[PDB]
Design a protein around this ligand. Sequence first.
Ligand SMILES: OC[C@H]1O[C@H](O[C@H]2[C@H](O)[C@@H](O)[C@@H](O)O[C@@H]2CO)[C@H](O)[C@@H](O)[C@@H]1O
Length: 565
Amino acid sequence: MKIEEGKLVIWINGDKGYNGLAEVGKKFEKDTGIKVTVEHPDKLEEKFPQVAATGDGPDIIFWAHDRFGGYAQSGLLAEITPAAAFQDKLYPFTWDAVRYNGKLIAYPIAVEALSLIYNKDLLPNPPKTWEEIPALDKELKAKGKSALMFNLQEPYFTWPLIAADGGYAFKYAAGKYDIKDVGVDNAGAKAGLTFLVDLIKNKHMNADTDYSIAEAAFNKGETAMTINGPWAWSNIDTSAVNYGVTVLPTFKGQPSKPFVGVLSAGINAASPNKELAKEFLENYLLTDEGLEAVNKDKPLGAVALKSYEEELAKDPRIAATMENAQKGEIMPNIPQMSAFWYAVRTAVINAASGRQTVDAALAAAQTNAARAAAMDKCWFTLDNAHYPPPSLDSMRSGHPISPASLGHLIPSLAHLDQIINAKAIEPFPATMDIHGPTIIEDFKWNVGLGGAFSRSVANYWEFDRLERYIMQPTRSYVQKCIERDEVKRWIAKNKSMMMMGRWEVYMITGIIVARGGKTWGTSQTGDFVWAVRLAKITKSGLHSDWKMETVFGKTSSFRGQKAIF
Ligand SMILES: OC[C@H]1O[C@H](O[C@H]2[C@H](O)[C@@H](O)[C@@H](O)O[C@@H]2CO)[C@H](O)[C@@H](O)[C@@H]1O
């Protein structure tokens, strides 16, 4: 489904209640006429940043909150603006889970955590410790069953055992997550992963077990236990298994520490239906009846809406979910969490199969997570210049004064003195929002932009803040830009035959303003555009429609500047 004004496209993982969500979308369509298309594509948490950059993703994306901070860093999420009356309807804990740089960047839906699900008929008294599971599996293999089966392919399900005796992702200190203090290869994490590998080495579990294998085995009554969240309860209801939901087993006397996720709905920063999305999420989904329809499809856990949460609070399965959640930790939403998960996923798979030892798997995972890096760089400093920032009022004016303002078309970064569309910027359509000012760095005079800024600005200490203004050009907006007389005449100045039917232009699609308040004076202490983001618009020939992409890494020219961040 293609995103378009007048419709809503929603992405939600295939294990959630997407049919119940679609029913809420049908009611929204009945009242308003706005069609709501719900989809559950594979690997949506990885597809979203790619398709959202191209402006061809969903209007609303559902996922656990850990991914949304990385989306917010890239500016892919619209800041949600709920009234105080609506914020009072949701628990403050859930609002805190969807906060990035102080701003709310998603609507919290429900708190979810892993629990131990056991067959009350096969196992009337579940084991309280991980250590007693081998002996239990031996007795259950004698009766034609197995003790425990759960998804060994995703680190989300193995992590509670890994973190039980001291494993952790990123240490929280000084009010921040220290991305250089990873606890993936410490003694606690080694003991946890070793116990898991020993369970496989002793044939108590198979390292190839995934989500489908474990769900089918438990719902058929072939294994006495599994580990899963509330979304899986309804499938067990359909089966003939009298099941229970209780605490995860302890390890070395310590409780298993599941990573607590908060299912959240973010709004695409490039969506042209932000008001429709806000209306659907606030007035239809985040209601007793919208959440009821979703929860009846696939249970959500402890929902964020206080009214429906109080209604479901008597459910003992929710109480077990809350107990495991209290014994665990909330997931960080820092952008490095994606690298953390990939590293731990590789480590568990390589240790469970025997490809690597536990020490070698976790050591490589520690390095890859702390070396998250790979932050594809698209920001170029404006060297040998001090361009004052454009006022937010003038950015939509069609003729901003500063050369470094959004919408300006330049031959190259080295030719910011040659604005092609100077004072003739094609009007931004009402769908193209300018996202900003976004505080990306609070200066208080390694990690952060302080090093790049201090190395680039002689009077760096005289500025306290960096503010980002981002826009995303649409195909139709660029088509109107390249059809204006200023661009047509600039293209027509070509004299070469090798460039006939060929062109390239750069559009300023992002600015980062330094806010304050060799010998330099008062002019250098004033605000200025420190960095810019560019989109390269190119037509390669007659039979090729023009393409556009954000300039990453470096620019292609003589003295091609390198992207600092
Ligand atoms: O396994 C790594 C994975 O863990 C979490 O994803 C969970 C998700 O939160 C649950 O709702 C459920 O769908 O299981 C998933 C694991 O398969 C993280 O949210 C995710 O970012 C991470 O990749």
